[PDB]
């Protein structure tokens, strides 16, 4: 047999373990197929009818959630285009936090259409220019589709009606109670002049009954116990101390130097007298509970229990700052008793036990306050993690709505209207970018088709009905979920609202990822290590 | 490539670069065998055999190179060799130069179709110029002598070259006819291992590789008769399985004599024929048989003084029939004396273990025999190859009614004609015409490089001498001065050059239209 | 070890259809080079 | 070409993945299927170290199974949740979930939407919870004797399917008295469970104080009387031995005078500490730190008892039983920081020396002495005692018992069938299957008892349709009787929690149609 040699040059100097893809068939088409196969995985889990996914990582852990961000983070894909898509999804989640699968589907459809656009004979520059023009047009006509706005932000009956649409997409069925709890937690921590913080929401997982036994708390909780014998105090003053509740010593290595029988007998007596004097001076300032963050001693604990002083020890750094900001007090780097400014403004401190777990609850009688804690209940850890993720998504949606009070109709009407407007505008553009504009207009139909496929009905009939409704004269009419027959329904009457800035940022990031992927025609890789 | 991961495949640029590199490597090796001033090669096989040759067809096969382009080039060279004769090294050089000139213009933003279309017109113009530049002569003895000398000058030294030229010319004139074409398979090539000097002459007759078997036979026989036959004389059994059923020893002896009477009858018939032909004792009788002879017949024929042979080839009978003029009969039915041959001097020569027979001195022989002599085996093979090449060149020059001067004046004239016809071609074929004209000037460049002089200055001087005077000014290989090729005695061939140009054009068209080397065959490995 | 079939592999329908379509497209793209008078010659 | 995921990733479709999940759930439930009623049998699990684990509770069996399946872990999670919540019906929720899965398997194979199944499960669970809360029927104002009788009946019903079923009339009063003396916070850490080898099962006693094992002793342990009439317990926490004052100390003694002075001062400090400890009027000295040989010999010359290496939990229990406090310093030993008891003995039980402390009327804790086997029997007895204590604690806070056996399941199934017989459409078949799946409890009970299940189930269905409500199964008479009149009561917090856990497990299992496994 005759063996064919290699090309004398870059092929011979390519070195082992490395690869080369110069042609468009082994590069652009391969990346397009990989992106399509990646988008086809998370395509069935998009709308509220999307199922969950049991993803098992290498650490022998279970992840039964519904958000696409965790799934994409727990895949470990060894593909450059898929890695770029995952990075874009992570950037979108960090910027907003409510649009990952939509961006993935949009990018997949755009790449699948660009595949045939390059196959028919069109180049890459004209396609990129047409896509950019279509994106600019969609961003220009985007603010012209606002049909709702948020009136008040501190009303319980109003905020709960806005995040319900976003919560129902994650938890289908039991969402009204979760929306009400999220609205109450956001109202109880809402100050003035805007400025809403995202780190003021605590999540406590306690195994017990189901989702009907969940309740909100206007304070903080810790999974510790009481060191002393003091049970619960009514009107107590918290005294936070960053230094450990013990006698201070020198930072430099030094030993004591006793003499005869006088110092050897007086040292312990003087130490005990100083400790007793310090304990008395600490409790004489009206303090009842002392919260430390270091190692405690036996003599100090006994002296604190003698004068009825509650001792709470915690080792979490950030928890001490959170407890200080919740009660209004600050920290102290030395054993110094407060006077009148560094006191405590609590209400009730008690130690309870729910679900065979002793926790210290710091309940506050004030309806406002600083931070809050949403005590969650459940029988499994996966359900608790899903509820926590849904609560975080609702908090992010509330923060986005507070940043921008512009509401747009959701479902599948805004995308259809944008596609129709782009198709009507692209018909008056000459050159070769008209085909790219028409393809970009067709990429918006991947959301209603996926929604109809996940609901359990046909997609072409639903798309035709939506197009006919939009051409008749209606705009705020989308697809129906509860209806078993392929019909339409009004989105304004049902209450389907979504964030406009989030969708705008998602579309911008999708267009950026598309124009970044459609710019590399050759990949140069090496060997894994 | 996705269906078969264990299969290598080259693209358009990679395969083209591989082919160009292979062509350059094959051209840079065979560039030292052009002209009589070349260098000799020493090939050593795996067993320990030494071969000293200078031909390009043998070097292209004894180089141990595994490549598809190299295999195709070797096959084309072997085809040219066994179809025409001398025209393999120059063919490979021209093919390599054309491929290099094509690759020089390909890596600039051009399509090989235009280069092929230009090469077609260039080949057409070269053929049209060669059809009128040829010189027709009467083809006498001096022309054939000069052609053979020019063909054999690039093989050995001088004296052996002239001896081989004279022997080839004499053999051709002896086997020459006026109505039938030049037929081969008539001159026997016998090799010997002694006298490597002036001893490779021509023998007017035939020399066999087997002598007599009976020691009582005569060694040197004067005037005798040649009997050509191929009948069996051994104990031939019947086709049907038979068997003897005797009774005593008398019946056994009778059955023994019965099976031998069949050969005794033929022996008596041969004896009677010899007695009727001769009669007295001043003549002899030589019998040439193709099959074996039993010892009984050899002993019976030795009593009458008959020198018979046995076990011969098929070409020997035809050679004897063409030389002596007898009848190669098969049976002893109409055994007439008119079906015999005439001889003059028959003597048996012994060379140790081997034994030969010389059949010389004939009336009008038509099949001679070249006696090759050499010190070793490599020299014998080289002399045999040189004699074969000279015979092929003489046959090609005789079959054609025209002559072509050698040296490198024809290539310069063709290049000048292509240059003059370059602006007369429309389209983008001007680059192809220029490349074809520059590729044909590889022979004078290699000749000047092997002679020991300059290349660019020599080519410029040759072009100036050709443009300043319309003559066939060749290239000298001794002083480097522009000399006339038709004045000294350097002659080539027309049909050979035409076939070489056609093969070069075909190879160029087949290579320039291929840019994909895929190997998706079965591995045939199970385990 | 109780098994129903030894050394047997079964796939789904969508994956098999996609693989067949990809193989057909690859065959068509490989064979599309030799077409028209401006095509090139191949060697095996 | 480069692949998408890493080399070694496994995936499947939806229908085969769900079928495999149902098969795994059925295989898991078939292991703890024979453990239910009183006629059930326990299992024997052996790990890699060669230690056996004999326990009748399904929680320990599911924990010792070591299942690495990504879908079979849903039963272990709800089992642990039920064990941590009420701690009773650990296998009932798993059986109900397995029955629901086996009932919806044909509906899933036929081609039904999982969202409709989840909605039907949620509606059925809500209806069952509402029906249970409606037919609860709790007392409004009862006396203490009625509450004690109810607690005793609940304890006897909870300790009927365990290994101590033959002595259920003795442990009921014990656990009742143990729970009644737990104040209102109900601290489970103040109940000491001691296991001493030797004796019989009926030889178990319950003291009204504290009792711990004898720790290490020196050469001054036999020269002291281990019996006192009215002693005083002094809780300390300082080391009583000849050692250095501080580890980071250096003494630069001059001549022999200062050396002798320091030598005398060390013993003077030791004697002063001993005198300050003895002058408190105590007789029993207890401390967590080990006591040296000097104090042990000093306390034996004044008819005083001492013991070192006292655990923290034992010291806390003794303090809660007596009424003292942990005194680290000996410079403040008054009369309000010392214990008080009426009797103090030191007998030998099973060849091991144990200290007894009882007689104090202000005791808020107790100690249990479990005798019988050697290890597995003692562990089973401790598990049964903990289960009974949890059942009594739940019944105290719920004060609403219901009929046991299988009457509540039959009533829920009848109500679900009557509700499904009204609403048409595809909602009738799902509720019907949910109601038919609840009838597996009496069938499983009859299969474990070895009786006819078909005839008993038919008779129960006929009696429930002709109604005559709290009618369950009977193992003694091999028929049917009144479970409410046979003193068979159970807390209502066990059925609702198990139903909610089963509904959550079903909703989490059905809503899964993909399983991705990463290499390594
Ligand atoms: N109640 C509803 N009615 C109609 N459409 C909905 C409803 N809830 C969610 N959707 C649609 O489902 C899609 C998925 O939303 P979601 O899963 O929250 O985020 P993402 O769009 O990132 O997947 C949205 O585009 C939205 O239009
Ligand atoms: N004596 C000579 N004078 C001039 N030219 C010669 C002479 N001998 C050979 N040549 C030239 O050298 C070239 C190569 O000849 P050779 O190597 O013998 O055979 P081939 O032509 O097959 O390569 C021929 O084309 C011929 O013109
Ligand atoms: N004495 C009894 N009479 C009637 N039914 C009983 C009796 N004891 C137990 N059972 C039934 O046996 C079932 C199993 O209870 P048990 O073994 O205590 O816990 P689990 O439900 O975790 O197995 C209970 O549902 C109960 O109705
Ligand atoms: Mg979202
Ligand atoms: Mg030659
Ligand atoms: Mg139980």
């Amino acid at each position: 047999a005759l063996h064919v040699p290699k090309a004398p040059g870059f092929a011979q100097m390519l070195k082992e373990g490395a690869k080369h893809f110069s042609g468009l068939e082994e590069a652009v088409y391969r990346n397009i197929q990989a992106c399509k196969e990646l988008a086809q995985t998370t395509r069935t889990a998009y709308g509220p009818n999307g199922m969950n996914k049991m993803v098992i990582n290498h650490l022998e852990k279970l992840f039964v959630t519904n958000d696409a961000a965790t799934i994409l983070r727990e895949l470990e894909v060894q593909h450059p285009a898929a890695k770029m898509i995952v990075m874009a999804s992570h950037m979108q989640e960090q910027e907003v936090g409510d649009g990952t699968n939509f961006v993935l589907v949009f990018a997949g459809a755009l790449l699948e259409l660009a595949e045939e656009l390059l196959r028919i004979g069109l180049s890459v520059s004209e396609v990129i220019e047409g896509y950019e023009i279509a994106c600019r047009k969609a961003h220009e006509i985007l603010p012209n589709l606002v049909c709702c706005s948020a009136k008040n932000l501190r009303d319980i009956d109003e905020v709960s009606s806005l995040l319900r649409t976003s919560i129902m997409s994650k938890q289908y069925g039991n969402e009204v109670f979760l929306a009400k709890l999220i609205a109450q937690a956001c109202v109880s921590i809402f100050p003035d002049s805007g400025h809403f913080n995202v780190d003021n929401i605590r999540v406590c997982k306690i195994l017990g009954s189901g989702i009907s036994s969940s309740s909100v708390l206007h304070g903080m909780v810790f999974k510790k116990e009481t060191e002393g014998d003091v049970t619960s105090v009514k009107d107590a003053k918290i005294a936070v101390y960053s230094c450990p509740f013990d006698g201070m010593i020198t930072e430099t290595k030094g030993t004591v130097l006793i003499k005869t029988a006088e110092e050897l007998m007086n040292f312990s007596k003087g130490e005990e007298n100083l400790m007793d004097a310090q304990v008395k001076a600490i409790a004489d300032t009206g303090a009842n509970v002392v919260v430390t963050g270091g190692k405690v001693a036996d003599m100090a604990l006994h002296y604190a229990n003698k004068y009825n002083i509650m001792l709470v020890r915690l080792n979490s750094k950030w928890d001490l700052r959170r407890l200080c900001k919740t009660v209004g007090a600050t920290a102290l780097p030395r054993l110094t008793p407060p006077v009148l400014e560094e006191m405590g403004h609590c209400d009730s401190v008690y130690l309870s036990e729910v679900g065979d777990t002793q926790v210290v609850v710091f309940k506050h009688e004030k309806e406002d306050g600083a931070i809050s804690t949403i005590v969650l209940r459940g029988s499994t850890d996966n359900l608790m993690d899903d509820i926590e993720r849904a609560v975080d998504d609702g908090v992010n949606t509330f923060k986005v709505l507070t940043r921008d009070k512009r509401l747009v109709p959701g479902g599948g009407a805004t995308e259809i209207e944008l596609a129709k407007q782009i198709t009507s505008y692209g018909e008056t553009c000459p050159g070769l970018e008209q085909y790219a504009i028409k393809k970009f207009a067709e990429a918006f139909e991947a959301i209603p088709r996926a929604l109809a496929e996940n609901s359990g009905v046909k997609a072409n009939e639903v798309i035709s009905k939506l197009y006919a409704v939009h051409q008749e004269g209606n705009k705020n009419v989308g697809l129906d979920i509860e209806a078993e027959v392929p019909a339409v329904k009004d989105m304004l009457e049902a209450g389907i609202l979504d964030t406009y800035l989030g969708k705008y940022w998602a579309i911008k990031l999708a267009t950026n990822a598309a124009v970044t992927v459609l710019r590399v025609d050759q990949i140069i890789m090496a060997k894994p290590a | 490539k996705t269906l078969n991961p264990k299969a290598e495949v080259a693209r358009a640029q990679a395969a083209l670069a591989v082919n160009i590199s292979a062509a350059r490597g094959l051209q840079d090796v065979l560039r030292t065998n052009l002209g009589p001033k070349g260098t000799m090669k020493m090939l050593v096989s795996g067993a320990g055999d030494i071969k000293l040759t200078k031909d390009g067809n043998v070097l292209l096969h004894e180089m141990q190179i595994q490549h598809p382009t190299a295999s195709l080039i070797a096959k084309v060279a072997t085809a040219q060799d066994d179809i025409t004769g001398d025209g393999t090294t120059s063919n490979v050089l021209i093919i390599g130069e054309l491929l290099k000139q094509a690759d020089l213009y390909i890596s600039e933003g051009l399509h090989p179709r235009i280069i092929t279309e230009g090469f077609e017109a260039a080949k057409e113009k070269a053929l049209q110029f060669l059809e009128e530049v040829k010189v027709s002569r009467e083809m006498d003895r001096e022309t054939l002598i000069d052609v053979a000398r020019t063909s054999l000058r690039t093989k050995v030294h001088a004296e052996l070259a002239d001896v081989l030229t004279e022997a080839v010319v004499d053999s051709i004139l002896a086997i020459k006819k006026q109505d039938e074409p030049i037929d081969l398979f008539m001159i026997e090539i016998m090799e010997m291992k002694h006298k490597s000097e002036t001893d490779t002459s021509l023998i007017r007759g035939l020399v066999l590789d087997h002598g007599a078997r009976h020691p009582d036979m005569k060694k040197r026989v004067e005037d005798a008769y040649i009997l050509t036959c191929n009948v069996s004389l051994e104990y031939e059994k019947t086709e049907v399985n038979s068997g003897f059923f005797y009774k005593s020893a008398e019946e056994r002896e009778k059955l023994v004599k019965a099976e031998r009477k069949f050969i005794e009858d033929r022996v008596k018939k041969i004896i009677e024929l010899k007695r009727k032909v001769c009669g007295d004792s001043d003549k002899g009788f030589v019998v040439i048989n193709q099959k074996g002879i039993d010892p009984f017949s050899l002993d019976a024929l030795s009593k009458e003084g008959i020198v018979a042979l046995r076990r011969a080839k098929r070409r020997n009978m035809e050679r004897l029939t063409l030389a002596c003029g007898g009848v190669a009969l098969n049976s002893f039915d109409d055994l007439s004396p008119d079906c015999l041959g005439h001889a003059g001097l028959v003597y048996e020569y012994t060379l140790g273990e081997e034994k030969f027979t010389f059949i010389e001195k004939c009336n009008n022989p038509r099949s001679v025999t070249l006696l090759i002599k050499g010190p070793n085996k490599h020299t014998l093979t080289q002399i045999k190859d040189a004699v074969r090449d000279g015979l092929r060149a003489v046959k090609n020059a005789i079959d054609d009614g025209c002559v072509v001067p050698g040296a490198g004046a024809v290539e310069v004239a063709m290049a000048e004609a292509l240059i003059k016809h370059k602006p007369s071609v429309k389209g983008r074929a001007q680059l192809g015409v220029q490349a074809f004209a520059d590729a044909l000037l590889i022979i004078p460049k290699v000749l000047a490089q092997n002679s020991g002089f300059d290349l660019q200055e020599t080519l410029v001087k040759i072009q100036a001498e050709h443009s300043e005077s319309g003559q066939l000014v060749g290239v000298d290989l001794n002083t480097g001065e522009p000399m006339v090729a038709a004045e000294v005695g350097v002659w080539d061939n027309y049909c050979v050059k035409k076939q070489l140009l056609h093969s070069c054009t075909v190879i160029a068209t087949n290579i320039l239209l291929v840019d994909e080397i895929m190997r998706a065959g079965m591995s045939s490995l199970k385990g | 070890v109780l098994v129903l079939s030894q050394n047997t592999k079964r796939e789904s329908g969508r994956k098999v259809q996609s693989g067949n379509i990809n193989a057909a497209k690859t065959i068509a793209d490989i064979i599309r080079t030799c077409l028209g008078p401006k095509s090139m010659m191949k060697m095996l | 070409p480069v692949i998408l995921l890493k080399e070694g990733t496994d995936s499947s479709q939806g229908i085969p993945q769900l079928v495999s999940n149902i098969s795994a759930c059925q295989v898991i439930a078939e292991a703890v299927r024979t453990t239910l009623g009183p006629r059930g049998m326990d299992k024997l699990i052996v790990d890699g170290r060669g230690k056996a684990t004999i326990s009748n509770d399904g929680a320990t069996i599911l924990k010792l199974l070591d299942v690495v399946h990504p879908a079979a872990k849903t039963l272990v999670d709800i089992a642990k949740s039920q064990d941590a919540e009420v701690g009773d019906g650990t296998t009932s929720v798993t059986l109900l979930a397995a029955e629901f899965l086996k009932q919806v398997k044909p509906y899933v194979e036929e081609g039904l939407h999982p969202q409709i199944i989840i909605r039907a499960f949620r509606t059925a669970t809500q209806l069952a919870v509402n029906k249970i809360k409606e037919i609860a029927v709790t007392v409004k104002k009862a006396d203490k004797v009625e509450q004690r009788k109810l607690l005793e009946k609940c304890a006897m019903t909870a300790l009927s399917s365990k290994l101590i079923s033959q002595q259920k009339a003795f442990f009921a009063k014990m656990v009742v008295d143990a729970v009644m003396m737990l104040d209102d916070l109900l601290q489970l850490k103040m109940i000491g469970i001691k296991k001493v080898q030797g004796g019989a099962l009926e030889d178990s006693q319950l003291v009204a104080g504290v009792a711990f094992k004898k720790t290490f002793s020196y050469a001054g342990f036999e020269m002291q009387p281990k019996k006192y009439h009215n002693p005083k317990i002094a809780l300390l926490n300082v080391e009583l031995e000849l050692k250095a004052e501080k580890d980071n100390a250096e003494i630069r003694v001059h001549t022999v005078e200062d050396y002798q002075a320091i030598v005398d001062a060390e013993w003077n400090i030791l004697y002063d500490k001993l005198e300050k400890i003895h002058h408190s009027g105590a007789k029993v000295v207890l401390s967590k730190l080990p006591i040296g040989d000097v104090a042990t010999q000093y306390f034996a010359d004044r008819d005083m008892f001492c013991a070192g290496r006292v655990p923290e939990e034992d010291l806390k229990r003794t303090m809660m039983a007596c009424g003292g406090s942990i005194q680290t310093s000996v410079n403040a030993l008054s009369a309000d920081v010392l214990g008080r008891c009426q009797v103090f003995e030191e007998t030998q039980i099973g060849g091991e020396r144990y200290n007894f402390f009882t007689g104090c009327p202000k005791a808020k804790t107790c100690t249990f002495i479990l005798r019988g086997g050697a290890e597995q029997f003692m562990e089973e007895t401790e598990r049964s005692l903990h289960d009974a204590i949890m059942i009594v604690r739940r019944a105290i806070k719920n004060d609403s018992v219901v009929a046991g056996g299988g009457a509540i399941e039959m009533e829920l199934s009848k109500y679900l069938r009557d509700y499904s017989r009204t609403i048409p459409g595809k909602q009738q078949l799902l509720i019907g299957a949910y109601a038919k799946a609840l009838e597996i409890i009496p069938r499983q009970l009859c299969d474990n008892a070895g009786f006819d299940a078909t005839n008993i189930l038919n008779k129960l269905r006929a009696r429930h349709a002709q109604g005559g409500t709290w009618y369950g199964v009977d193992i003694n008479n091999e028929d049917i009787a009144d479970n409410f009149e046979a003193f068979v009561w159970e807390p209502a917090m066990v059925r609702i929690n198990a139903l909610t856990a089963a509904s959550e497990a079903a909703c989490l299992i059905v809503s899964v149609d993909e399983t991705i496994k990463n290499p390594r």
Side-chain angles (χ1 to χ4, degrees), chain A residues 45-49 66-68 92 97-103 164-170 172 393 409-413 415 447 451 478-481 489 491 494-498 503:
Chain A
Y46 178 71
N49 305 130
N66 206 269
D67 203 58
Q92 221 289 328
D98 213 358
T100 74
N101 207 5
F102 164 74
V103 183
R164 191 188 55 85
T165 312
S166 177
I167 290 175
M168 199 180 186
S169 66
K170 321 283 290 188
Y172 179 49
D393 272 358
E415 285 86 20
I447 299 101
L451 281 171
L479 82 155
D480 205 354
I481 303 298
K489 205 176 62 178
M491 294 293 110
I496 311 300
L497 274 311
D498 75 275
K503 280 277 167 55

Side-chain angles (χ1 to χ4, degrees), chain A residues 1-8 11 22-26 30, chain B residues 2 8-11 14 17-18 21 66-68 71 517 519:
Chain A
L2 304 177
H3 289 67
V4 51
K6 225 176 285 287
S22 187
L24 302 175
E25 189 98 352
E26 312 170 3
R30 291 292 122 89
Chain B
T2 66
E8 308 157 322
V9 57
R11 316 207 61 186
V18 161
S21 171
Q66 214 176 324
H67 213 265
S71 304
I517 302 183
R519 184 181 169 260

